[PDB]
Homo-oligomer: A and B are copies of this chain.
Amino acid sequence: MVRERTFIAVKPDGVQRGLIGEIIKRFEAKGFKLAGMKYIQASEDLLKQHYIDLADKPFYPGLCKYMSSGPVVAMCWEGTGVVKTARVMMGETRPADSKPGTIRGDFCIEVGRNIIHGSDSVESANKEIALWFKPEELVSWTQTNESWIYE
């Protein structure tokens, strides 16, 4: 009944370049179930927490201001192996390492403008989802076509 969930974000360059629908469409088409979504400009402090494990890296300060400089689409998607499979659908961290067919492969060039975020582990997803959504903002429901996706 209840399956694995991950945190997915359309970054500000994704919003600005008009790729929200294209990204959602790819996840709907794959078979994953939307559990949460909101549209916000988050605080620099929230992003500092979101990327807390990278607080060490040189790019960290600039990253968090950039990721809070504009609206992002915050999402929670549900389905078997969704944390890892979402990463595959995105490509690699660097669009230059990303295959055609992937989101970053089809749409971006630079690492600092790679339009999308996804949790790198189940445990990360739990933190990120909790950081971005209140429990009551998460919708539990049953997709009608579930039995043609999961046996």
* A residues adjacent to B (C-beta < 8 A): 12-13, 15-32, 34, 36-41, 66, 70-71, 73, 79-81, 85, 88-89, 91, 96, 99-102, 105-110, 112-113, 137, 139, 141, 143-145, 147-151
Task: Point out the residues of chain B lying under 8 angstroms from A102, CB to CB.
Answer: 100-101
Give Cα distance in the complex from A73 to B75, angstroms.
12
Task: Point out the residues of chain B lying under 8 angstroms from A29, CB to CB.
Answer: 18, 21, 106-107
Supplied contacts A16-B144, A39-B137, A110-B149, 12 more A-B pairs, CB within 8 Å: A21-B21, A21-B24, A21-B26, A30-B108, A30-B109, A32-B109, A34-B39, A81-B96, A81-B109, A88-B100, A100-B102, A101-B105
Copies of this chain held together in the complex: 6
Give Cα distance in the complex from A103 to B74, angstroms.
25
Q: A70: which of B18, B113, B141 is its contact (CB, 8 Å)?
A: B141
- CB nearest neighbor in B for A88: B100
Task: Point out the residues of chain B lying under 8 angstroms from A21, CB to CB.
Answer: 20-29
Task: Tell whether, in the assembled complex, residue A39 and residue B40 are in contact, meaning their CB atoms are under 8 Å apart.
Answer: no
Task: Point out the residues of chain B lying under 8 angstroms from A16, CB to CB.
Answer: 143-145, 148
Give Cα distance in the complex from A127 to B8, angstroms.
31
Give Cα distance in the complex from A33 to B79, angstroms.
27
Give Cα distance in the complex from A88 to B100, angstroms.
7
Task: Point out the residues of chain B lying under 8 angstroms from A70, CB to CB.
Answer: 141
Give Cα distance in the complex from A73 to B25, angstroms.
14
- CB nearest neighbor in B for A27: B21
